[PDB]
Amino acid sequence: SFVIRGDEVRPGQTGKIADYNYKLPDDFTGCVIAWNSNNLDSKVGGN
Amino acid sequence: YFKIYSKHTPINDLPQGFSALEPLVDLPIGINITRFQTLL
Amino acid sequence: VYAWNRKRISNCVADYSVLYNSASFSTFKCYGVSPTKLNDLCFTNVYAD
């Protein structure tokens, strides 16, 4: 579980998330679900 | 790119012989070249 | 829309489009290459669009 605006929401990727947040394996077996928390992350800025 | 090849040879019509030309230039141009003239 | 250049310059030594590698600039799609192999691979086209 994490929160990301960097590289928007987005395991076959090498982006702002992959190198600066987390890398899921290119063969990663599993599911990903991303919930926009603009109204749920409370402070919107979310620094 | 644009290519020019050439060869130096004595020429004795255009008598036949066996050879190949070597490049002179390789210049990216992007020109829709369709016609030409030579210059004296 | 009325312009897609190809050769702004024929010879570049300053080629590091990290804009893609780290997505430090924006979103992108690479065709036939890794987005990260920017200084490992080289092409004779250095500009476009």
Tab-separated table of N, CA and C in Angstrom:
chain	number	residue	atom	x	y	z
A	1	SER	N	0.802	-1.210	0.000
A	1	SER	CA	0.000	0.000	0.000
A	1	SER	C	0.842	1.271	0.000
A	2	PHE	N	0.500	2.212	-0.876
A	2	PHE	CA	1.202	3.499	-0.938
A	2	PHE	C	0.343	4.570	-1.575
A	3	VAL	N	0.842	5.792	-1.664
A	3	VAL	CA	0.060	6.813	-2.305
A	3	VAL	C	0.898	7.476	-3.379
A	4	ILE	N	0.371	7.590	-4.586
A	4	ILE	CA	1.173	8.182	-5.625
A	4	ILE	C	0.480	9.124	-6.605
A	5	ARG	N	1.067	10.301	-6.773
A	5	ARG	CA	0.684	11.271	-7.794
A	5	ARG	C	1.814	11.373	-8.736
A	6	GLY	N	2.986	11.015	-8.232
A	6	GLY	CA	4.145	11.051	-9.070
A	6	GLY	C	3.877	9.976	-10.088
A	7	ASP	N	4.110	10.263	-11.324
A	7	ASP	CA	3.862	9.293	-12.392
A	7	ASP	C	2.423	8.861	-12.307
A	8	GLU	N	1.555	9.808	-11.970
A	8	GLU	CA	0.143	9.577	-11.857
A	8	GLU	C	-0.092	8.307	-11.076
A	9	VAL	N	-0.998	7.482	-11.578
A	9	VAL	CA	-1.181	6.166	-10.987
A	9	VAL	C	-0.040	5.215	-11.367
A	10	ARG	N	0.486	5.362	-12.597
A	10	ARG	CA	1.529	4.553	-13.150
A	10	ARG	C	2.139	5.364	-14.251
A	11	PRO	N	6.050	-3.053	-12.714
A	11	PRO	CA	5.436	-4.212	-13.349
A	11	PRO	C	5.492	-4.005	-14.872
A	12	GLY	N	6.712	-3.978	-15.443
A	12	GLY	CA	6.893	-3.691	-16.868
A	12	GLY	C	7.052	-2.192	-17.116
A	13	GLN	N	7.536	-1.469	-16.114
A	13	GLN	CA	7.738	-0.037	-16.247
A	13	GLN	C	8.986	0.437	-15.515
A	14	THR	N	9.647	1.453	-16.058
A	14	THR	CA	10.807	2.054	-15.413
A	14	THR	C	10.630	3.570	-15.312
A	15	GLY	N	9.674	4.043	-14.509
A	15	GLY	CA	9.385	5.484	-14.453
A	15	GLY	C	9.718	6.200	-13.149
A	16	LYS	N	8.994	7.302	-12.910
A	16	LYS	CA	9.224	8.071	-11.710
A	16	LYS	C	8.903	7.100	-10.607
A	17	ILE	N	7.863	6.286	-10.794
A	17	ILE	CA	7.630	5.313	-9.764
A	17	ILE	C	8.686	4.239	-9.726
A	18	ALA	N	9.002	3.642	-10.838
A	18	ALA	CA	9.877	2.509	-10.717
A	18	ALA	C	11.201	2.807	-10.049
A	19	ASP	N	11.881	3.851	-10.457
A	19	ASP	CA	13.189	4.078	-9.885
A	19	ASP	C	13.116	4.911	-8.640
A	20	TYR	N	12.104	5.774	-8.520
A	20	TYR	CA	12.050	6.650	-7.374
A	20	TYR	C	10.967	6.270	-6.372
A	21	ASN	N	10.186	5.245	-6.618
A	21	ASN	CA	9.181	4.813	-5.662
A	21	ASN	C	9.321	3.321	-5.463
A	22	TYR	N	8.832	2.531	-6.400
A	22	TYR	CA	8.943	1.088	-6.253
A	22	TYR	C	8.863	0.406	-7.589
A	23	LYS	N	9.552	-0.707	-7.716
A	23	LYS	CA	9.498	-1.535	-8.912
A	23	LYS	C	8.823	-2.848	-8.777
A	24	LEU	N	7.776	-3.080	-9.524
A	24	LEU	CA	7.179	-4.396	-9.419
A	24	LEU	C	7.900	-5.198	-10.489
A	25	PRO	N	8.161	-6.479	-10.299
A	25	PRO	CA	8.839	-7.299	-11.265
A	25	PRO	C	8.172	-7.281	-12.612
A	26	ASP	N	8.973	-7.386	-13.648
A	26	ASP	CA	8.448	-7.428	-15.000
A	26	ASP	C	7.590	-8.667	-15.191
A	27	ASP	N	7.836	-9.702	-14.385
A	27	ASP	CA	7.053	-10.915	-14.385
A	27	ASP	C	6.117	-10.920	-13.177
A	28	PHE	N	5.831	-9.753	-12.612
A	28	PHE	CA	5.069	-9.717	-11.391
A	28	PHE	C	3.712	-10.303	-11.560
A	29	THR	N	3.392	-11.217	-10.662
A	29	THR	CA	2.140	-11.894	-10.721
A	29	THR	C	1.261	-11.371	-9.610
A	30	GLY	N	0.175	-10.730	-9.977
A	30	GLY	CA	-0.692	-10.129	-8.985
A	30	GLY	C	-1.564	-9.090	-9.636
A	31	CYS	N	-2.291	-8.304	-8.820
A	31	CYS	CA	-3.204	-7.252	-9.272
A	31	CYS	C	-2.866	-5.910	-8.680
A	32	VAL	N	-3.188	-4.857	-9.411
A	32	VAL	CA	-2.961	-3.522	-8.912
A	32	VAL	C	-4.206	-2.678	-8.966
A	33	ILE	N	-4.495	-2.031	-7.868
A	33	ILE	CA	-5.624	-1.178	-7.861
A	33	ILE	C	-5.250	0.226	-7.371
A	34	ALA	N	-5.607	1.252	-8.145
A	34	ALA	CA	-5.250	2.640	-7.799
A	34	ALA	C	-6.465	3.547	-7.629
A	35	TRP	N	-6.639	4.081	-6.417
A	35	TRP	CA	-7.769	4.932	-6.050
A	35	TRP	C	-7.480	6.364	-5.865
A	36	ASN	N	-7.971	7.167	-6.771
A	36	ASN	CA	-7.686	8.576	-6.710
A	36	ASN	C	-8.182	9.040	-5.372
A	37	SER	N	-7.298	9.630	-4.577
A	37	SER	CA	-7.641	10.064	-3.249
A	37	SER	C	-7.741	11.559	-3.103
A	38	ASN	N	-8.131	12.253	-4.156
A	38	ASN	CA	-8.192	13.714	-4.095
A	38	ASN	C	-9.103	14.192	-3.018
A	39	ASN	N	-10.136	13.426	-2.765
A	39	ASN	CA	-11.064	13.739	-1.715
A	39	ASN	C	-10.885	12.832	-0.504
A	40	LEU	N	-9.842	12.027	-0.509
A	40	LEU	CA	-9.637	10.999	0.503
A	40	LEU	C	-8.271	11.113	1.163
A	41	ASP	N	-7.362	11.873	0.552
A	41	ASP	CA	-6.021	12.004	1.060
A	41	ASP	C	-6.016	13.181	1.996
A	42	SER	N	-7.202	13.694	2.316
A	42	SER	CA	-7.325	14.834	3.182
A	42	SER	C	-6.581	15.976	2.574
A	43	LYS	N	-5.537	16.430	3.237
A	43	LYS	CA	-4.824	17.535	2.678
A	43	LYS	C	-4.510	17.172	1.248
A	44	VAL	N	-5.066	17.964	0.347
A	44	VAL	CA	-4.901	17.714	-1.060
A	44	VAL	C	-3.503	17.839	-1.528
A	45	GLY	N	-2.791	18.830	-1.011
A	45	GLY	CA	-1.438	19.049	-1.458
A	45	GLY	C	-0.681	17.752	-1.334
A	46	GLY	N	-0.828	17.076	-0.205
A	46	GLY	CA	-0.202	15.789	-0.107
A	46	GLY	C	1.274	15.883	-0.303
A	47	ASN	N	1.931	16.842	0.354
A	47	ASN	CA	3.329	17.080	0.032
A	47	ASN	C	4.126	15.807	0.297
B	1	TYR	N	19.238	10.300	-45.345
B	1	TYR	CA	20.222	11.304	-45.707
B	1	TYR	C	20.530	11.360	-47.189
B	2	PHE	N	21.236	12.378	-47.609
B	2	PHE	CA	21.713	12.500	-48.983
B	2	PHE	C	23.093	11.916	-49.198
B	3	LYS	N	23.238	11.103	-50.244
B	3	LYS	CA	24.509	10.461	-50.505
B	3	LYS	C	25.146	10.826	-51.831
B	4	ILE	N	26.455	10.992	-51.792
B	4	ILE	CA	27.231	11.127	-53.018
B	4	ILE	C	28.390	10.177	-52.933
B	5	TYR	N	28.612	9.378	-53.978
B	5	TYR	CA	29.780	8.496	-54.092
B	5	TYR	C	30.482	8.890	-55.372
B	6	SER	N	31.775	8.614	-55.455
B	6	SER	CA	32.549	8.916	-56.644
B	6	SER	C	33.768	8.041	-56.796
B	7	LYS	N	34.337	8.077	-57.991
B	7	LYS	CA	35.584	7.392	-58.269
B	7	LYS	C	36.426	8.136	-59.299
B	8	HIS	N	37.734	8.183	-59.050
B	8	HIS	CA	38.688	8.740	-59.995
B	8	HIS	C	39.210	7.637	-60.900
B	9	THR	N	39.271	7.917	-62.188
B	9	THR	CA	39.744	6.963	-63.167
B	9	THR	C	40.016	7.660	-64.478
B	10	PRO	N	41.020	7.259	-65.274
B	10	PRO	CA	41.174	7.762	-66.606
B	10	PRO	C	40.048	7.166	-67.413
B	11	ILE	N	39.508	7.935	-68.337
B	11	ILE	CA	38.464	7.436	-69.213
B	11	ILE	C	38.950	7.567	-70.653
B	12	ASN	N	38.996	6.446	-71.394
B	12	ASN	CA	39.494	6.386	-72.768
B	12	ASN	C	38.340	6.618	-73.743
B	13	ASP	N	31.464	8.380	-76.033
B	13	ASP	CA	30.826	7.307	-75.273
B	13	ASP	C	31.477	7.162	-73.895
B	14	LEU	N	30.965	6.221	-73.073
B	14	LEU	CA	31.464	5.950	-71.733
B	14	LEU	C	31.938	4.511	-71.677
B	15	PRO	N	33.209	4.220	-71.995
B	15	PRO	CA	33.735	2.880	-72.058
B	15	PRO	C	33.508	2.161	-70.741
B	16	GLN	N	33.234	0.878	-70.863
B	16	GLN	CA	32.935	0.014	-69.747
B	16	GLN	C	34.172	-0.425	-69.012
B	17	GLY	N	33.961	-0.800	-67.772
B	17	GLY	CA	34.994	-1.286	-66.896
B	17	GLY	C	34.332	-1.678	-65.599
B	18	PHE	N	35.103	-2.386	-64.773
B	18	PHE	CA	34.583	-2.878	-63.508
B	18	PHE	C	35.177	-2.143	-62.333
B	19	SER	N	34.325	-1.521	-61.547
B	19	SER	CA	34.728	-0.760	-60.377
B	19	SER	C	33.508	-0.434	-59.548
B	20	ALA	N	33.721	0.175	-58.384
B	20	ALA	CA	32.630	0.661	-57.555
B	20	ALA	C	33.011	2.018	-57.006
B	21	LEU	N	32.017	2.863	-56.817
B	21	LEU	CA	32.252	4.205	-56.290
B	21	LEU	C	32.275	4.197	-54.770
B	22	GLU	N	33.096	5.075	-54.187
B	22	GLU	CA	33.226	5.214	-52.739
B	22	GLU	C	32.522	6.485	-52.306
B	23	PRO	N	31.939	6.559	-51.113
B	23	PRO	CA	31.164	7.692	-50.691
B	23	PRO	C	32.017	8.910	-50.523
B	24	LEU	N	31.417	10.037	-50.793
B	24	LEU	CA	31.990	11.322	-50.542
B	24	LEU	C	31.246	11.949	-49.381
B	25	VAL	N	29.914	11.996	-49.468
B	25	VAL	CA	29.166	12.630	-48.389
B	25	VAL	C	27.939	11.843	-47.986
B	26	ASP	N	27.558	12.020	-46.714
B	26	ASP	CA	26.346	11.486	-46.108
B	26	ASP	C	25.695	12.617	-45.315
B	27	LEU	N	24.749	13.317	-45.924
B	27	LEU	CA	24.192	14.521	-45.309
B	27	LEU	C	22.685	14.509	-45.142
B	28	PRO	N	22.126	14.374	-43.943
B	28	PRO	CA	20.699	14.482	-43.745
B	28	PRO	C	20.240	15.810	-44.316
B	29	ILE	N	19.263	15.779	-45.224
B	29	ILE	CA	18.748	17.007	-45.832
B	29	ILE	C	17.236	17.165	-45.732
B	30	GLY	N	16.473	16.114	-46.061
B	30	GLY	CA	15.024	16.253	-46.078
B	30	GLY	C	14.472	17.052	-47.244
B	31	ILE	N	15.071	16.939	-48.417
B	31	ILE	CA	14.614	17.712	-49.561
B	31	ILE	C	13.930	16.818	-50.568
B	32	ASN	N	12.750	17.228	-51.018
B	32	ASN	CA	12.018	16.463	-52.022
B	32	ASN	C	12.626	16.740	-53.382
B	33	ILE	N	13.812	16.198	-53.601
B	33	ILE	CA	14.539	16.414	-54.836
B	33	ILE	C	13.924	15.592	-55.933
B	34	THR	N	13.559	16.242	-57.040
B	34	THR	CA	12.964	15.539	-58.154
B	34	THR	C	13.622	15.848	-59.490
B	35	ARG	N	14.340	16.969	-59.593
B	35	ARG	CA	14.972	17.449	-60.816
B	35	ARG	C	16.350	17.995	-60.516
B	36	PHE	N	17.161	18.139	-61.555
B	36	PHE	CA	18.468	18.727	-61.388
B	36	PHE	C	19.039	19.363	-62.637
B	37	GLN	N	20.093	20.135	-62.429
B	37	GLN	CA	20.937	20.638	-63.515
B	37	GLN	C	22.398	20.500	-63.116
B	38	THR	N	23.271	20.319	-64.085
B	38	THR	CA	24.691	20.330	-63.776
B	38	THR	C	25.215	21.743	-63.960
B	39	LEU	N	26.400	22.019	-63.448
B	39	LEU	CA	27.034	23.328	-63.567
B	39	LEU	C	28.405	23.201	-64.226
B	40	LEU	N	28.755	24.116	-65.169
B	40	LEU	CA	30.034	24.098	-65.882
B	40	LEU	C	31.044	24.970	-65.141
C	1	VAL	N	1.794	21.066	-36.553
C	1	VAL	CA	0.822	20.422	-37.455
C	1	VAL	C	1.286	20.688	-38.872
C	2	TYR	N	1.888	21.850	-39.108
C	2	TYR	CA	2.463	22.130	-40.419
C	2	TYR	C	3.955	21.956	-40.319
C	3	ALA	N	4.416	21.273	-39.277
C	3	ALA	CA	5.828	21.030	-39.234
C	3	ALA	C	6.315	19.894	-38.367
C	4	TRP	N	7.021	18.994	-39.015
C	4	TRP	CA	7.689	17.931	-38.329
C	4	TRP	C	9.100	17.788	-38.849
C	5	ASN	N	10.053	18.480	-38.223
C	5	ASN	CA	11.403	18.492	-38.729
C	5	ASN	C	11.975	17.125	-38.464
C	6	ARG	N	13.154	16.875	-39.013
C	6	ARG	CA	13.879	15.642	-38.739
C	6	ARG	C	15.347	15.925	-38.374
C	7	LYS	N	15.942	16.937	-38.979
C	7	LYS	CA	17.353	17.163	-38.750
C	7	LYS	C	17.628	18.583	-38.369
C	8	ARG	N	17.474	18.883	-37.092
C	8	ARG	CA	17.766	20.235	-36.666
C	8	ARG	C	19.269	20.400	-36.680
C	9	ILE	N	19.973	19.298	-36.424
C	9	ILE	CA	21.415	19.277	-36.453
C	9	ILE	C	21.828	17.861	-36.838
C	10	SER	N	22.927	17.715	-37.568
C	10	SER	CA	23.386	16.395	-37.986
C	10	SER	C	24.268	15.651	-36.985
C	11	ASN	N	24.803	16.351	-36.004
C	11	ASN	CA	25.737	15.766	-35.060
C	11	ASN	C	25.542	16.290	-33.654
C	12	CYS	N	25.067	15.440	-32.719
C	12	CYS	CA	24.882	15.832	-31.339
C	12	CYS	C	25.775	15.037	-30.400
C	13	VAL	N	26.281	15.750	-29.403
C	13	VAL	CA	27.060	15.131	-28.350
C	13	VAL	C	26.337	15.226	-27.012
C	14	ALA	N	25.344	16.094	-26.932
C	14	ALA	CA	24.541	16.310	-25.745
C	14	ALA	C	23.225	15.557	-25.840
C	15	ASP	N	23.273	14.241	-25.818
C	15	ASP	CA	22.059	13.455	-25.968
C	15	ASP	C	21.718	12.645	-24.741
C	16	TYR	N	20.827	13.180	-23.934
C	16	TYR	CA	20.414	12.487	-22.750
C	16	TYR	C	18.971	12.816	-22.454
C	17	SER	N	18.044	12.213	-23.198
C	17	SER	CA	16.621	12.489	-22.977
C	17	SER	C	16.070	11.774	-21.776
C	18	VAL	N	16.575	12.149	-20.608
C	18	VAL	CA	16.167	11.585	-19.335
C	18	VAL	C	14.718	11.925	-19.114
C	19	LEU	N	14.229	12.893	-19.887
C	19	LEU	CA	12.853	13.295	-19.857
C	19	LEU	C	12.026	12.025	-19.950
C	20	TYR	N	12.555	10.997	-20.646
C	20	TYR	CA	11.906	9.726	-20.765
C	20	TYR	C	12.407	8.773	-19.709
C	21	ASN	N	13.717	8.680	-19.538
C	21	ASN	CA	14.273	7.653	-18.646
C	21	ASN	C	13.653	7.680	-17.259
C	22	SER	N	13.598	8.849	-16.644
C	22	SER	CA	13.020	8.961	-15.308
C	22	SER	C	11.620	9.520	-15.356
C	23	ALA	N	11.133	9.781	-16.561
C	23	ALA	CA	9.882	10.482	-16.773
C	23	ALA	C	9.929	11.790	-15.980
C	24	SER	N	11.103	12.433	-15.952
C	24	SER	CA	11.283	13.667	-15.227
C	24	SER	C	10.543	14.803	-15.900
C	25	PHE	N	10.176	14.620	-17.169
C	25	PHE	CA	9.484	15.656	-17.893
C	25	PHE	C	8.002	15.351	-18.070
C	26	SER	N	7.673	14.221	-18.695
C	26	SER	CA	6.273	13.904	-18.977
C	26	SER	C	6.077	12.455	-19.381
C	27	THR	N	4.844	12.122	-19.777
C	27	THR	CA	4.504	10.768	-20.200
C	27	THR	C	5.055	10.498	-21.587
C	28	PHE	N	5.255	9.218	-21.907
C	28	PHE	CA	5.836	8.848	-23.181
C	28	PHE	C	5.586	7.415	-23.578
C	29	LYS	N	5.865	7.120	-24.836
C	29	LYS	CA	5.857	5.754	-25.336
C	29	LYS	C	7.053	5.530	-26.255
C	30	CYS	N	7.864	4.480	-25.993
C	30	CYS	CA	9.025	4.128	-26.810
C	30	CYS	C	8.719	2.879	-27.617
C	31	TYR	N	9.119	2.915	-28.872
C	31	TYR	CA	8.886	1.842	-29.803
C	31	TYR	C	10.194	1.228	-30.243
C	32	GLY	N	10.380	-0.039	-29.906
C	32	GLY	CA	11.567	-0.785	-30.310
C	32	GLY	C	12.772	-0.637	-29.402
C	33	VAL	N	12.690	0.250	-28.426
C	33	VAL	CA	13.797	0.480	-27.523
C	33	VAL	C	13.360	0.596	-26.080
C	34	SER	N	14.296	0.387	-25.169
C	34	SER	CA	14.081	0.683	-23.766
C	34	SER	C	14.091	2.187	-23.580
C	35	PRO	N	13.216	2.777	-22.775
C	35	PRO	CA	13.279	4.172	-22.442
C	35	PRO	C	14.541	4.551	-21.697
C	36	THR	N	15.223	3.569	-21.098
C	36	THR	CA	16.383	3.875	-20.290
C	36	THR	C	17.710	3.791	-21.014
C	37	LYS	N	17.755	3.088	-22.122
C	37	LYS	CA	18.999	2.940	-22.830
C	37	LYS	C	19.181	4.106	-23.785
C	38	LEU	N	19.401	5.268	-23.198
C	38	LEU	CA	19.527	6.503	-23.953
C	38	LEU	C	20.959	6.830	-24.302
C	39	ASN	N	21.899	6.395	-23.466
C	39	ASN	CA	23.312	6.624	-23.744
C	39	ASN	C	23.984	5.302	-24.088
C	40	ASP	N	23.180	4.243	-24.181
C	40	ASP	CA	23.688	2.944	-24.597
C	40	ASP	C	23.398	2.721	-26.070
C	41	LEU	N	22.314	3.312	-26.553
C	41	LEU	CA	21.922	3.174	-27.941
C	41	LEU	C	22.111	4.500	-28.609
C	42	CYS	N	22.374	4.491	-29.925
C	42	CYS	CA	22.483	5.714	-30.693
C	42	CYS	C	21.932	5.532	-32.090
C	43	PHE	N	21.327	6.607	-32.553
C	43	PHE	CA	20.691	6.789	-33.817
C	43	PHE	C	21.206	8.046	-34.519
C	44	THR	N	21.072	8.114	-35.837
C	44	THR	CA	21.532	9.293	-36.568
C	44	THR	C	20.478	10.398	-36.695
C	45	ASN	N	19.325	10.189	-36.083
C	45	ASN	CA	18.252	11.172	-35.999
C	45	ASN	C	18.273	11.771	-34.605
C	46	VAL	N	18.437	13.082	-34.512
C	46	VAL	CA	18.536	13.745	-33.214
C	46	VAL	C	17.415	14.729	-32.904
C	47	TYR	N	16.456	14.876	-33.795
C	47	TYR	CA	15.379	15.818	-33.567
C	47	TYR	C	14.224	15.493	-34.460
C	48	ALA	N	13.064	15.954	-34.101
C	48	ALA	CA	11.940	15.715	-34.933
C	48	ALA	C	10.820	16.652	-34.555
C	49	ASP	N	9.770	16.700	-35.369
C	49	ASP	CA	8.489	17.327	-35.026
C	49	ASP	C	8.615	18.852	-34.991
